[PDB]
Write a protein that binds this ligand. Sequence first.
Ligand SMILES: [Zn+2]
Ligand SMILES: [Zn+2]
Ligand SMILES: [Zn+2]
Length: 178
Amino acid sequence: NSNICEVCNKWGRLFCCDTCPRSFHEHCHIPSVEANKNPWSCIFCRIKTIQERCPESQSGHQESEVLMRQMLPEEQLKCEFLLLKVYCDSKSCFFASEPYYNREGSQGPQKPMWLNKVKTSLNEQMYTRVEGFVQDMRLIFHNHKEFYREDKFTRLGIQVQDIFEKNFRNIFAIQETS
Ligand SMILES: [Zn+2]
Ligand SMILES: [Zn+2]
Ligand SMILES: [Zn+2]
């Protein structure tokens, strides 16, 4: 197995996947690494099993259809992995914890949002459809763009949203287009 956490790229107290060589800190993995369970399969493995059990699941889908799906176990898992893929980028540090807003010439967002809040929401099964999760994720970046205006720091929002959006397309197998 790897000797660094797959998500944050740090050594420390790592839990090892039994079916691939990745490793995780406890709370880096999403969901948090399970108490017992030997063997244990990480979320990368579980997602691959879903694709393998239903190859047709990788055929193209319409985003509109994906968003209206109910958060049954498989959609729940897919959202958890998508969240994890965002945390895998070091720039996610900017969007992880609860922000605050005091900048000359700007007003804070009406509805603040941050990755840890989303993480808690998923963990507490607060989303009934994929839409709920996707809206909150896109809100993080939209709020950031709006607040930082013409400061070049707006680019961080664009960059992390691109990571989100590419992984969303890949995980939910959105139909490729030009
Ligand atoms: Zn980690
Ligand atoms: Zn694995
Ligand atoms: Zn099948």
